[PDB]
Amino acid sequence: AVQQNKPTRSKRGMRRSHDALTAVTSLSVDKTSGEKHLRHHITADGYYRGRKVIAK
Amino acid sequence: MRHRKSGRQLNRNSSHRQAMFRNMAGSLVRHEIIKTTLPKAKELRRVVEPLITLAKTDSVANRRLAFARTRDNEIVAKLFNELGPRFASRAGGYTRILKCGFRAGDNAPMAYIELVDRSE
Amino acid sequence: MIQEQTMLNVADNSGARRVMCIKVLGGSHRRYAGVGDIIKITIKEAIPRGKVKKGDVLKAVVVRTKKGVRRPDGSVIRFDGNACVLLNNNSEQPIGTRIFGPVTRELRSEKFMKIISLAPEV
RNA sequence: AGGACCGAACCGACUAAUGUUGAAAAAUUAGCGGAUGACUUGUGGCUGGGGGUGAAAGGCCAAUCAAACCGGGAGAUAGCU
RNA sequence: GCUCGCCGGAAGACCAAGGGUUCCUGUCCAACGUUAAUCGGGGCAGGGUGAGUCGACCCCUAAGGCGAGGCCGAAAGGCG
């Protein structure tokens, strides 16, 4: 009751075809600044949705 | 299973989550913004909003409460004096949540929780 | 609930506190007995003033349940003991002269009214 | 007074469960039990191969044992593989 | 720094065997701790082990080992 003969490398390619990670393109920008973020978090500059959320 | 239980069981035993979120309530009122995981930022809202509602009335009988789980030497004058007009007098909506992104080097979602009014 | 291998008190006059339920009847597979419906009993103690023998196999009917009588409105009428009364297997009818039980509507739904009605309790 | 009734420390194997490519070279969790004795124990010794040790199973003798382990005769012998 | 939690006959304190540079400050982050590592019993340096009286030795010696003169044995070895 063990694997006998090796599975095909096309079948290995097809089982690996089900990937869903994205290249995140395009990234979103703030309504007052062209700085990039994912569609629901803050920028690393304190800008967010044209509101400004973290001071310096 | 869970067919009316809307409480998040989150991670580790209930007695940890109790101790931790009762400590985090003291940590939140001290600095008025705290950073943690998105699940922890939302689970800190539970029973702390009723605790803010509890801090509104300045009567000597209500001054007996808000004292069983979270204590600190520097809230003793704000209790039953400021927490009303600053927060509890709003009638709900005492906090704000916002995801700040991911955790350093790993896929954990990170957020900040703040109080709905900032001191002037 | 009354079932196979249950020991009960008996509603028959000069009957002992101990009679054994050997079958719940109904021909098909059955879990528990039912009020106003038959059950198979053996006598585990006999009282000399009574009209039964120890170790004898007899027919009975359930006359009070701790589960209560409750079909028509869901409003329960309840009792503080489980008991049956003894029936003859050929001539029919309750074998005793008095019954110790509430003698409810489903017992008068049987052919027995003449020998149960000395004391109605509900 | 006690090869005495229950019982900590101390000891310890009987049932049950978990564990069983484990934390594991035999433990873990719960209970029942041994506890002035024909007992237990800290420390150092003494008993060896057909010999030891055993209120005695051919059990135990450093995981091994109807005869331990290592090194030699030994590349012994196999009408067989 | 403030706050919380658990153990509290231990999840504490002291002594010993057995191990062996482990102690401390001063830094370093390749490898190690089956990670992150800025920490470290890890790397690599530098500093540290002050005794008449403490544990050992002293002096006697149990079990046991050795063993003269002497004995047994080719002998290894052994008795007393």
Place this chain on the structure above:
RNA sequence: ACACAGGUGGUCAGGUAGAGAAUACCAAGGCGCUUGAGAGAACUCGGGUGAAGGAACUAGGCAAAAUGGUGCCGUAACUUCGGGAGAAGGCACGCUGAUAUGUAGGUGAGGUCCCUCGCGGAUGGAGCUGAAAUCAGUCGAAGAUACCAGCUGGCUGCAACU
């Protein structure tokens, strides 16, 4: 073999409760981990809840739950007269008052006393400490309130008991 749920010698064990080294909150003291984040389904492991029925389950009450403290009562057969026996079967328990406004148990000044002088000796009972228990009345679901803490009876092969 490991920074391994393991193995391992000697000395120590306060407060409150409690007979107590059981057992908990604690004390002094210590640690918060050498993968983390989260989630949550059939199923896997243990613990918790248990209606009405109950040993029917099973080879077997195994396992599990109930009993559980100790002062006063009350106890069979058999027996090596010891035992069986905590047989079996019952009462009481907080708090306060009234029993003994605190009894039993332990401890005890001066004086009387005997001398030798003297850390006197010895006789005694003012004082100190202090169980376990009882009864009434009121309160609770429940007072041996938690942890801790005995299932009971009968027939019988065989084996002295430890």
Place this chain on the structure above:
RNA sequence: AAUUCCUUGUCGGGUAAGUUCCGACCUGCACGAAUGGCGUAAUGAUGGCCAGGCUGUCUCCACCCGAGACUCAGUGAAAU
């Protein structure tokens, strides 16, 4: 019967029934006095048969709590 096929002998008791249990019997194919005989209590890590309490063993499970089944990141196997 720790000794006995057919045997659950044969009878009695317990039981709705009972190859089990308790008690007798003799016709032991083959017990027997130190290779001992027979009996008695507390007692037995002893075995068989019943009664009661209590109870999720079971009718029949139903729902919880703490840990795995899932998933993502870090470090990433073995038998075959």
Place this chain on the structure above:
RNA sequence: GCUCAACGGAUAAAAGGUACUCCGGGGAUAACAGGCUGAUACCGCCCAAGAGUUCAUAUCGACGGCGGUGUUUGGCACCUCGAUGUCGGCUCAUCACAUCCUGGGGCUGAAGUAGGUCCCAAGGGUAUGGCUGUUCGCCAUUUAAAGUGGUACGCGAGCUGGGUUUAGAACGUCGUGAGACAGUUCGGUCCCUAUCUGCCGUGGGCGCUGGAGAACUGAGGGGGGCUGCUCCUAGUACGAGAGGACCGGAGUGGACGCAUCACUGGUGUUCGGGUUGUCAUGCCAAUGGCACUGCCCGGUAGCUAAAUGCGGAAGAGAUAAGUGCUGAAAGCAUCUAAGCACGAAACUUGCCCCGAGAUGAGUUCUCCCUGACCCUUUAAGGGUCCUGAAGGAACGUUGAAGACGACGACGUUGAUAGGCCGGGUGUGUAAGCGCAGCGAUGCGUUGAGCUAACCGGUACUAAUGAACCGUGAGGCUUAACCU
């Protein structure tokens, strides 16, 4: 001259035992299972000494004969001894039909009800209690039945492990004895990191071709299928009577299966209150943490069965056995040949659910798009710019939707999740103040105080412009219409 006679003789000199062992070889060789055969086994048919008060053949059969079966008890020694778990116990399948029950009805020593016997049929069904290792057996009560067989006399990469079939013990017997035993009991393990074929939910492609969106077809598959009790017809048929039925005409049940949480129970570790030990806010009160959710006493929302509601349909089509019409081969006769008609719990629909990968890739409606340039040179292929509809994706708030995915609600054209407000269910009259009572404790202010899920109210907190994917009327033809 050696019965060395094991005789063609292994040495002035050699016997037994191993289930305590153990070594090399093996289905060459047995056992538990696979094949072959069917004497044995159970059954039928030819046939008939007889039984069946008559009568051989309703029913049953001595004798002789010829088969039906694979299928047992045996025979047999092929493939298996580098290792097919055996009996019984639990838990659960699939195929036969030699039919126990359920539907059909024939023959009869069948008036009727029945009994005896026969065969069309495997769609549904086919207990429970005690004794034993247990099948096998026995006993008590239930039943529409308490059918038989194949599948290693079905289910150990299934559960159990008492017997048989481990080391140790203990009894009876045989032997000189180690041993041996158609003599027997006590204690005695049950392993598994799931690869491939399979099964059961669920993502993602390719496809119908210019792209999207909403929904529905039915070639085909699955599910479903029996039955207990009672009453009317009716005391009808048959029959003095005794006794007592088909035919169709309803109601009511169980195992079993489904659904909801409304009742009745249960549980309900986000909650109300009492309490023993103790710690903590200085201490006291009030109050909280721990001690198994300390002990509990309880429980909303929810879920659940032990609760309640319901369930295996009516109808249509077509058959087998079987009954027939009309009729020729056989001028009669004949269910068959030509030609017509009926019939079973079977068979197929209808019912209920799936279902175009039905590649044999179904079908309607709606939405949208009317741009140019270059190269080889070409009805083929490649490149460039311009800037893009319909729609999707992203993102929340989170769910009655989940392991991951897939899917619902909606996102200020805002009640999607929460808090807050008014109240429910459920707890139980507290605190603070005083009073009665040495006091425990009780009393008034007080139906106090407390709240989550249920009901209603409310923008108080939170919920991006829209980037990105998607572009420009989309190849050929048969036939008709519009232009």
